[PDB]
C-alpha cells in the first residue's frame, strides 16, 4: 500500500467558521433568562430582588459557553499554521 501524507493548511480557516456558527446560539439563552426576569417581576415585583442572582448566573454560564465556542476559533487560527 502506498502512503500519502497531506497537510491542508487552509483547513486552519474552515473549522473556525463551524465554531462561529455556534458562537451565537447561547444568545438565545441569554435573553431567555432576562425575558423571564421581567415576566416574573411583572407578576411579583416583591421577588425581583431575589431572582436577579439566578438570572446573572444563567447569563454567565450561557456567555461562558459562547466564550469557549469562540475561544476554539480564536485558538484555531491565531496559533495554528
Amino acid at each position: 500500500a502506498i502512503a500519502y501524507e497531506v497537510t491542508v493548511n487552509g483547513a486552519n480557516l474552515i473549522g473556525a467558521g463551524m465554531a462561529a456558527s455556534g458562537v451565537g446560539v447561547p444568545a438565545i439563552g441569554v435573553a431567555m433568562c432576562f425575558s423571564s426576569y421581567m415576566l416574573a417581576a411583572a407578576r411579583q415585583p416583591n421577588m425581583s430582588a431575589k431572582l436577579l442572582p439566578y438570572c446573572i448566573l444563567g447569563f454567565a454560564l450561557s456567555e461562558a459557553l459562547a466564550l469557549f465556542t469562540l475561544l476554539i476559533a480564536l485558538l484555531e487560527l491565531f496559533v495554528f499554521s
Binding site: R43, Q44, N46, M47
Partner: protein
C-alpha cells in the same frame, strides 16, 4: 374570617390550582367543585362550592 392558613387548593376551568403564601396576584373564576383548605396543623377542610371568584394577594 381572615383565618391563618398554610395552603389552599382551588379548582378552575383551566384546571386545578394550588395557592401558598406570597402567591402572585391573580383573580380568576372557580369552577364548580371542591375546595381544600390546609391549616398549619396539617389538618384539612374540604368545601363544595357553586362558582365564585378567587382574589389572591401578594401580601
Amino acid at each position: 374570617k381572615q383565618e391563618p392558613v398554610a395552603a389552599i387548593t382551588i379548582r378552575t376551568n383551566e384546571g386545578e390550582m394550588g395557592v401558598l403564601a406570597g402567591h402572585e396576584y391573580t383573580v380568576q373564576q372557580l369552577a364548580p367543585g371542591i375546595l381544600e383548605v390546609e391549616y398549619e396543623g396539617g389538618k384539612k377542610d374540604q368545601y363544595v362550592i357553586s362558582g365564585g371568584f378567587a382574589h389572591v394577594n401578594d401580601t
